[PDB]
Each structure stands twice: as C-alpha cells, then as structure tokens.
Structure 1
C-alpha cells in the first residue's frame, strides 16, 4: 500500500502564531496525466466529523480561510496555519487519493495559554450509591493549565493508588484550560471503616499541593 506519515504527533502554540506540520508518503502522489498531487488535508475538531480543508496539495476548499496553506509536491507535504486562533485546536489528517485512499496517523494541535491552578472540589459517596453496596469518592480538578498534573489520595493520612481512575477533558476551546476527574472507588465496608478522606493536586503553579478533605465525624 501507499503509507502516510505525519510529524510531529503533537504540538502546542499560542494564539496569533503560525504552525507547520509535515506529511510524507511512501510513493509519489503526482498524477502526471493531470499534473496534480492527490493529497488532501482534513481538520477534525474533538467530537466532530472530519472536514476537508485542502485538496490537490494547495487548493483550498470553498470557504476555508486563507490562513490555512497547503504546499509540497511528490512525497513531501506541508500544512501551514497562519495566526492560529483558539478555535483551530483539532487533529489534522493528511489523506492520499492517488491510489484508493489512506489517511496518516494525525497531528494534534493544542492552544497555549498562561498557567493556571486547578479549582479542586471533593465529594463523598452519595447515600444513594451507598445503598447499592458501592462507594466512590470523587475529586474534580477544574480549569487548569498546563495538562500535566498529579493527584494523590489519602485515607486517614495514608496514600491509596489502587481503585483510582483519572479522566481529562479535551482542551477547552473557549478558555483553553483542561479539567480532570479523579474517582476513588472502594467497597462500602472499607469506606465506613475510615474517617478522613483527602485528595491533593500537585500542579506546577505552586510547590504547595491544593488539598480538599472531608471527615465523616463532622
């Protein structure tokens, strides 16, 4: 088959900057019958259907802004985005149409912004969940940047790693912050054995962990 290779896999830039990203095929995409390179660029914003930006390597799809530019010939192709906006965050795919079709693996575009510390909140098991035999302790770590963040759970001062599942939102398009849930699941038996529950966010906006807590005695 023809193989399609994008690089880099990910990149982050600030609002108003330029980006470029590469796409390389294992074989020439030039059809000398028509003198066009059968290469195309797609934008897939999170939770949406892919949208075609560029075809024939550099012809813009009707109604695509001029700040997106395709270039290259043969085996080597480049997409350029001029003055990157917040709304451009998305995965960009190249697609050859010279023989059948095949997509590259994609380049993820992330919007840079000022660092920001998470708003942390902690929630004990709901009483409704407790009647079912389960116990889930929840922490929300909301509206922080950058994405890298550490969460530690303590039960009566003592760290717990098993039973913890973490899930990050896609980068907000509006303000560009990330959010994350951490959920500590336990048996009701174990939950009612201990009193003090704690979740701690270590993020590079401080050397001090942000800590929220609750005590079942209070």
Structure 2
C-alpha cells in the first residue's frame, strides 16, 4: 500500500504572494507504460466538498484558474499558487491513484493581513428563552485580525468563569478576518437576581479592552 505525506501542515501568506506546498509518496507513482504520475491535488473550502484542481501531477482540471500549478515526479510533488487570493482559503490535499487511493494529511492555507480591532456587540436573553427557564447572554466579537483574542465576562462588576462557551469562525474570504462568539448561560432565576452584564474584549489592536454592557431594566 502507498503512504502519502504533505508539508507543511499550514502556512500563511499575504494576498498576491506565491505559495508552494509539498507532497511525498512512499513508492513511486510513475507508471511504466505511461509517462504519467498518478497524483492529484484537491481544494477543500470550509463546509464544501473537495474540488479537483490538478491530475497527472501537472494537468489542470477545466475551470481551474491558471494560478494553480502542479509539478514533480516519482515520489516528490509540489502544488504552487501564484498570487494567492483570499478566496484561496482552504485545505489542500494531494492524493495518489497508482494503486487504490491515498490522501495526504492536507496543508492548511491561511491569509496574512493588517491588524483590525473587533466590533463588539452584546445581547440579552430573549423573552422566548426566558419562558424556557434558562438565559443566555451572547457577545459577538466580529471582523478582527489576528485570531488571538480574550473575552472576559462580568455580572454586577464581578468576573465569571463557569458557563461561558466560545466559538471562532474560519477566516473569512471576504476580508480575511476572524470572528468570535461568546455565550454565557445561566438559569433564568440566576439571571434575574442580577442586573448588569458585561463582556470585555482584549485584542492586540488596543491596550485597553472593548467593553459592552446591558442592564436588565434599561429602556
């Protein structure tokens, strides 16, 4: 059986730069009678099926923009993207079809861009939720770069650790930023016993946190 290795596991480039990524096979993929290497490259964007880019190591699939090139032979192969676009955000896999099929581990491509501060929004529990007996407060930290960010929650001025779940988006092709949601869930009875809820965002773009608050009797 054939074993496939890709490197690096990820890499970051700025829009318009060139990137090359590498694939190795445990056995040659060069065919005897043929002059072809049975090696294909695939692009998989978040939430989508893989898409064929190149086959026979170097033939481009129809519709594939000409910025994607494949090269190499035997046990050593390369995929090159000239002038990366933010729409190229994806995992890239090589795959042998010399005997059966084997995918490489993938190379994740990330985009580098200018730092941007988060836009921070806080939201109280809905009255729908409250009739359920539970109560989520949600904070969106949107359209920021780089990815590293800290969020802190306070109730009536006091920090809070349990019941806070966080989730980051994939890097956006539209503007190369990240976003983050933070949800604090409490029981309805604990939520009503307290009056003020605050979410604080610490990002490298500014030395002081961005702070959003709401009060249960604000109107």
Deviates more, 1:118-127 or 1:169-178: 169-178
Deviates more, 1:34-43 or 1:61-70: 61-70
Is 1:16 aligned to residue 16 of structure 2? yes
Q: CA deviation at 1:84?
A: 0.7
Q: CA deviation at 1:168?
A: 1.5
Q: CA deviation at 1:156?
A: 2.0
Q: CA deviation at 1:212?
A: 0.5
Q: CA deviation at 1:174?
A: 1.3
Other structure's SS at 2:199 match: strand
Q: CA deviation at 1:185?
A: 0.8
RMSD: 1.3
The CA distance in 2 between the partners of 1:163 and 1:2, in whole Å, is 46
Aligned to 2:74: 74
Deviates more, 1:58-67 or 1:205-214: 58-67
Q: CA deviation at 1:158?
A: 2.0
Q: CA deviation at 1:161?
A: 2.2
Aligned to 1:134: 134
Q: Tell me the alpha carbon deviations over residues 65-111 of structure 1, each in whole angstroms, 9 at most, x when there is no partner.
A: 22211111122111110011121111111111011111112111122
Aligned to 2:150: 150
TM-score, normalised with respect to structure 1: 0.95
Matches within 5 A, 1:90-105: 90-105=90-105
Q: Tell me the alpha carbon deviations over residues 8-45 of structure 1, each in whole angstroms, 9 at most, x when there is no partner.
A: 12211111100011111222211122121111101112
Number of aligned residue pairs: give it: 218
Other structure's SS at 1:185 match: strand
Other structure's SS at 2:185 match: strand
The CA distance in 1 between the partners of 2:95 and 2:114, in whole Å, is 34
Q: CA deviation at 1:217?
A: 4.3
TM-score, normalised with respect to structure 2: 0.94
Unaligned runs of 5+ in 2: none
Q: Tell me the alpha carbon deviations over residues 158-196 of structure 1, each in whole angstroms, 9 at most, x when there is no partner.
A: 222221111112221111111111111111122112222
Other structure's SS at 1:37 match: coil
The CA distance in 1 between the partners of 2:144 and 2:133, in whole Å, is 34
Q: Tell me the alpha carbon deviations over residues 55-74 of structure 1, each in whole angstroms, 9 at most, x when there is no partner.
A: 11111112322221111112
The CA distance in 2 between the partners of 1:127 and 1:112, in whole Å, is 41
Deviates more, 1:177-186 or 1:58-67: 58-67
Other structure's SS at 1:189 match: helix
Q: CA deviation at 1:215?
A: 2.1
Q: 1:128 to 1:63 in 2, by over 3 A?
A: closer
Q: CA deviation at 1:117?
A: 0.3
The CA distance in 1 between the partners of 2:159 and 2:99, in whole Å, is 56
The CA distance in 1 between the partners of 2:13 and 2:124, in whole Å, is 38
The CA distance in 2 between the partners of 1:102 and 1:193, in whole Å, is 58
Following TM superposition, where does structure 1 have runs of at least 4 consecutive aligned residues deviating by more than 6 angstroms? none
The CA distance in 2 between the partners of 1:110 and 1:133, in whole Å, is 42
